[PDB]
Nucleic acid binder design. Structure first.
Length: 70
DNA sequence: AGACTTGTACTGGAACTCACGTGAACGAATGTTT
């Protein structure tokens, strides 16, 4: 972002779907359950920028969580 | 590829039980003292 501001736009990197136990996935779902929004290809959100791979449901970055990927 | 879940088998420790040992205590007989 411009100096002294929070990030506004995001660029997709990759899907990850392994490395979490069932309980961790349940807790993550409960945390982010309220903030999921349906994804419409015709009116994509401004904050998230995607290529050919698009999600079924998108969550605004302000309410999401950081994940470590190996 | 990778990561988690499920199923099978194994091994060590907990708990329970019996055998054996040791410690302390005691009534009766005997020996000693007065």
């Amino acid at each position: 972002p411009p100096p002294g501001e929070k990030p506004s736009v995001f660029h997709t990197l990759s899907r990850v779907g392994s490395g979490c136990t069932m309980k961790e996935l349940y807790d993550l779902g409960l945390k982010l359950a309220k903030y999921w929004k349906p994804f419409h290809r015709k009116a994509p959100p401004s904050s998230i920028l995607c290529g050919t791979e698009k999600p079924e449901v998108y969550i605004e970055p302000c309410n999401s969580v950081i994940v470590q990927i190996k």
